[PDB]
Design a binder for this molecule. Structure first.
Ligand SMILES: *[C@@H]1O[C@H](CO)[C@@H](O[C@@H]2O[C@H](CO)[C@@H](O)[C@H](O)[C@H]2NC(C)=O)[C@H](O)[C@H]1NC(C)=O
Ligand SMILES: *[C@@H]1O[C@H](CO)[C@@H](O[C@@H]2O[C@H](CO)[C@@H](O)[C@H](O)[C@H]2NC(C)=O)[C@H](O)[C@H]1NC(C)=O
Ligand SMILES: *[C@@H]1O[C@H](CO)[C@@H](O)[C@H](O)[C@H]1NC(C)=O
Ligand SMILES: [Ca+2]
Ligand SMILES: [Ca+2]
Ligand SMILES: [Ca+2]
Ligand SMILES: [Ca+2]
Lengths: 284, 407, 146, 407
């Protein structure tokens, strides 16, 4: 269970992260990002801030072998609204009432309105800031040759005019264009300088704000295994982290490589087993 | 454990007793007599519905449908809007002649060409002519009429041209059907023998839509503008480098367009809201009305509202949306002076006797959903001869040889 | 891994107790006691104070189907010193050098001494307090019938 | 991955290259030529050892042994010490006649009775007489001799009594063998046809030792004193309610006992320390020497040290432990006045010609491990006639009919 405050819990009991098992493993690299990998071929990425979002990845071996609100993954998108009892539905809210996991839930219906007409005070704030996805003076015009922002602009105005905390829906929709642009090579170094920088400068004393934080930039305890939990195949995320060197210590700031740790309990850099505690590796 | 006949295949993860389960209609029902749901309507057991060529049956809460392969349809409509044979919607505003469908794909038997010209000042283009190449015969649909060009010597692939409602309908014996509303909207239909054997701006008709953007050199691209620029006919035609935005280049036309086109999302079309998604038809209507800025914009509007109401008839919802103030139609123009036979049938569904079908001649698709003015011939001459728009006695209609009416 | 300070850790990572899974579960009822139950039929009880001790329980379905320093559990105790390569050994330290989990461990040998002769100061303290298991005025004479 | 030929079946959980592995002897050896270990000795491939009736072979680092079923042995020794046929050690100090072995177990063919009397003042008892019932013949072992009682009329189950070293050995044709050191130690052996068909204080001989405490009424108890009190012969004999502690009831005899009996854990017996566990023989010797407090305690001692040295010979380690100050033996008593033929053989292993075995007569077990004085007959009469302790010429020995020597 992945609650919306962290709080990963297995079988109604809290767990400590990381948690690596034989069939799956759950990681937490950046405190607003959880990465779950499975041996079947399923990978999850749970976003926690500004709003909770979810990204699911399957291999192409599981092609035409899944059902849910994510379709059946067969190449055609005309039959994604095909229910589990025959026929293709017309609207999204008619398809998705067939996938209720509880029988006592009411049926939902579509909504043929736009939120930027129902709210006149939110529709100028939505126009000024979501237009940055379309103008080329910003660090979003670098992605215009690959991603074509005309459909992210329409959703950015949708969520901004609709939700009650309008900046958390702006910054979530601007961080989803930047997410789907790093998936095609073009990584946006430094798009958070004028728009959503209310958490950039709040990193601790030694570590800074990064745009390419990955699982295998961890402590020297990760260097003790070094082939057990790395889990390649995910996407890089943006959070507080340490630069090109000076790996993370056991707690607090990230010291350089010479006096990192020796991980058993993580001993300090003054202990002799005959293995003198050294830079990363041990003389054993 | 409380099952519900809708959460059968969900899994029951997180009233009726054991055995019985709810049906969504009322009291508790056994699993065998469980009903079925389709587009927000509830159908009891042993009910029959049709889906476009097939017939289904609510058996045990699931649908049991026949497996025949239907005709496939490409659409071209308004200011550069497309739907491929596999159902992929895109926009392309090109100014040249473009391949719509052909089977000269890498030798061939037909080709259908569209001629897209600028209609407006914003840079959007719409389709104004259709050229049909069948073997060596060349038709051309231009200026509200069909023209025969280059009829070959003795081959003469059998085609038929007749007028059904407001549209003109060309059919071929080889399985090729072109339906044209005489302005900008085209419907191409192919028999299911053309599966995976065509190309062009309409795709390749292989029931798999992530390869419809294959270019002329057999490369699947992800851009609408690298795909569409590769099917131009002349090499000296320019490339389209961006798609225009008409309601941004005409800010003063946005308030009219979004108020007229809001009929589609209103209570007039509320029977069709659960059967056809109105959202890509609302966005096409606003795109079309912001850009008819040189003249005649109430023709650009009434076509976009009749593209949605045609799908509604085709899915089982006849809606009567025209009024004398909103898109009027003039069907008593065709009457003999005050004998009243031509009526506006808003959803086409009437099967009367022509002088073709009295001699066995029948079509291969069902065109009984096309809006227009239809006759209701009297009981002293109840046979409608189509090429003169006259009701005649069953003896004195005509000849119909080599696609020409001879009295 | 059950270290001798608490500190249960799964795959070189600390866990929080309780930890209930599909195939096993680890409990901690009294902070000097860990209880581990498995779905196969194996139950563990790890004692932590005063000294670390271990108690293992198998069902009788697994009878004649285990090997280790705990024997083979077949009813006879003459063949518990039977090694994994044939024959029964004579002494406990000759049997148990065949069950080293590491190849670089040295071989151990028996010790035919008693510790209460090597230490004269510990052997009066041992006599006075361990005699309470045998005298009946204490709350240990209630168990002498069983 | 560093295998070691001793950690083959461990599992390699937590030098030699890949392929080769250590052998515990020296350099790296392939897996096929891997040696074997048994009781701290290292045996190379294709080596042969015997285990009590069988033969083994070091094949590929494992032992390949033959599967024959050996004779089973019950022991009664010292101040009330037992070992059952399935190898369960216990203590019982009863004062009555007790069933040792019988097959009248819930109809029967034999019975062996032991007569346990108090030897000391502390309440411990030791065995002083054996009665053997075979059919209707009754032997009795009493006062250093065998006595025939009630020889039946014409059945007369064929038994044989001879003297091998310091012990007296009765054998039967039916498979029953009783070995007696003429004081307190008895060894019963049964042929493997008696599996699971006996009972008594020696168990039931079914290769499963958690049911040897079955009482006379067929109930498995957990007490040594509820089991042993149920095999008494007379109902008016008392019940043993506790086991005595002799070194606590005689504190002044503990220092002598623990110093004399420490030969067993010393460097004299250090060849046998890896083959027989000395610890239950040290505790028996101290229990026996603290309790011979009425007279003759150097006989209670020397028997307990010869119970351990007998197992050592039986397992392959001949130890010479007697000196003129510690348990002396007097074997030149038997010599013709100063012609020296009777030698002390400390571990029995000599196979000479008697006047039985010159006429084919052989036993069914191997009694060549029994300590005592053995002849070494000269080369003018090399045949030892046993019932007179004389070396005779092969012609003039005797008759041996109906278990009686006739000159
Ligand atoms: C409907 O489709 C059928 C099937 O192709 C057409 O029948 C063909 O007609 C041509 C000449 O008109 C013949 O050469 C073919 O052999 C026919 N096909 C078969 C299978 O017999 C029919 O013409 C089509 N309908 C119309 C009105 O054209
Ligand atoms: C050793 O055991 C054999 C096997 O039982 C004994 O042979 C039996 O001898 C009796 C009479 O002496 C016969 O009635 C049996 O038929 C014999 N058994 C078989 C299988 O033939 C033999 O007597 C024993 N050895 C000694 C010395 O008594
Ligand atoms: C992230 O990018 C920066 C470039 O400024 C550089 O430190 C490095 O390429 C990345 N940092 C990592 C992988 O820690
Ligand atoms: Ca699909
Ligand atoms: Ca396709
Ligand atoms: Ca055993
Ligand atoms: Ca037994």
């Amino acid at each position: 269970v992945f609650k919306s405050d962290g709080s990963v819990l297995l079988n109604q009991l809290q767990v400590n992260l990381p948690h690596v098992t034989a069939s799956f493993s759950v990681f937490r690299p950046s405190s607003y990002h959880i990465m779950v990998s499975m041996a079947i071929g399923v990978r999850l990425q749970v976003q926690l801030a500004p709003v909770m979002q979810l990204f699911v990845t399957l291999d192409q071996a599981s092609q035409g072998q899944v059902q849910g609100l994510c379709g059946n993954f067969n190449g055609l998108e005309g039959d994604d609204f095909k229910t589990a009892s025959g026929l293709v539905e017309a609207t999204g809210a008619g398809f998705a009432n067939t996938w209720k996991a509880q029988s006592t839930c009411h049926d939902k219906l579509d909504w043929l309105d736009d939120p930027c007409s129902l709210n006149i005070e939110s529709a100028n704030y939505a126009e000024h800031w979501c237009s940055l996805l379309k103008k080329t003076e910003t660090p979003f015009g670098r992605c215009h040759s690959a991603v074509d922002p005309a459909e992210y602009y329409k959703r950015c105005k949708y969520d901004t005019c609709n939700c009650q905390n309008n900046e958390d829906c702006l910054c979530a929709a601007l961080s989803s264009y930047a997410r789907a642009c790093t998936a095609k090579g073009v990584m946006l170094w430094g798009w958070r300088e004028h728009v959503c920088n209310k958490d950039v400068g709040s990193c601790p004393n030694s570590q800074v704000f990064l745009y390419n934080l990955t699982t295998c930039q961890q402590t020297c305890r990760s260097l003790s295994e070094a082939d057990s939990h790395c889990l390649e195949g995910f996407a890089p995320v943006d959070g507080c982290g340490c630069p090109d060197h000076t790996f993370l210590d056991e707690k607090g700031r990230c010291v350089p490589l010479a006096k990192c740790s020796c991980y058993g309990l993580y001993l300090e850099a003054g202990d002799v087993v005959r293995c003198v505690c050294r830079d990363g590796r041990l003389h054993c | 454990r409380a099952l519900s006949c809708q959460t059968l295949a969900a899994g029951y993860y997180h009233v009726c007793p054991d055995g019985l389960m709810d049906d969504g209609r009322g009291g508790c029902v056994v699993e065998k007599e469980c009903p079925c749901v389709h587009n927000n309507d509830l159908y009891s057991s042993g009910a029959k519905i049709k889906v476009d060529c097939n017939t289904c049956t609510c058996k045990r809460g699931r649908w049991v449908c026949t497996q025949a392969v239907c005709h496939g349809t490409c659409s071209i409509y308004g200011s550069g809007h497309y739907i491929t044979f596999d159902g992929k919607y895109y926009d392309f505003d090109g100014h040249c002649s473009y391949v719509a469908v052909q089977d000269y794909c890498g030798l061939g038997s037909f080709s259908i060409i569209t001629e897209n010209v600028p209609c407006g000042t914003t840079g959007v283009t719409c389709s104004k002519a259709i050229k049909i190449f069948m073997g060596r015969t060349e038709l051309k649909l231009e200026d509200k009429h069909r023209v025969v060009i280059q009829r070959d010597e003795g081959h003469h692939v059998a085609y038929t041209t007749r007028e059904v409602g407001q549209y003109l309908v060309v059919e071929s014996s080889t399985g090729i059907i072109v339906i044209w509303d005489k302005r900008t909207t085209v419907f191409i239909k192919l028999a299911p023998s053309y599966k995976g054997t065509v190309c062009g701006l309409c795709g390749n008709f292989d029931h798999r839509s992530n390869n419809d953007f294959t270019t002329r050199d057999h490369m699947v691209v992800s851009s609408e503008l690298d795909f569409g620029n590769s099917w131009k006919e002349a090499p000296t035609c320019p490339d389209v480098s961006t798609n225009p935005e008409p309601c941004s280049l005409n800010p003063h036309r946005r308030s009219w367009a979004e108020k007229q086109c809001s009929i589609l999302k209103s209570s007039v079309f509320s029977i069709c809201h659960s059967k056809v998604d109105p959202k890509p038809f609302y966005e096409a209507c606003v795109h079309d009305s912001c850009s008819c800025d040189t003249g005649g914009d109430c023709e650009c509007f009434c076509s976009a509202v009749a593209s949605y109401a045609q799908e509604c008839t085709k899915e089982g919802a006849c809606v009567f949306w025209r009024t004398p103030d909103l898109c009027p139609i003039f069907c008593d123009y065709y009457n003999p002076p005050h004998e009243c036979e031509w009526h506006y049938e808003p959803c086409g569904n009437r099967s009367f006797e022509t002088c073709r079908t009295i001699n066995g001649i029948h079509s291969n698709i069902s065109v009984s959903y096309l809006e227009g003015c239809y006759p209701r011939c009297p009981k002293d001459r109840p046979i409608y001869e189509e090429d003169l728009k006259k009701c005649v006695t069953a003896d004195k209609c005509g000849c119909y040889v080599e696609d020409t009416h001879y009295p």
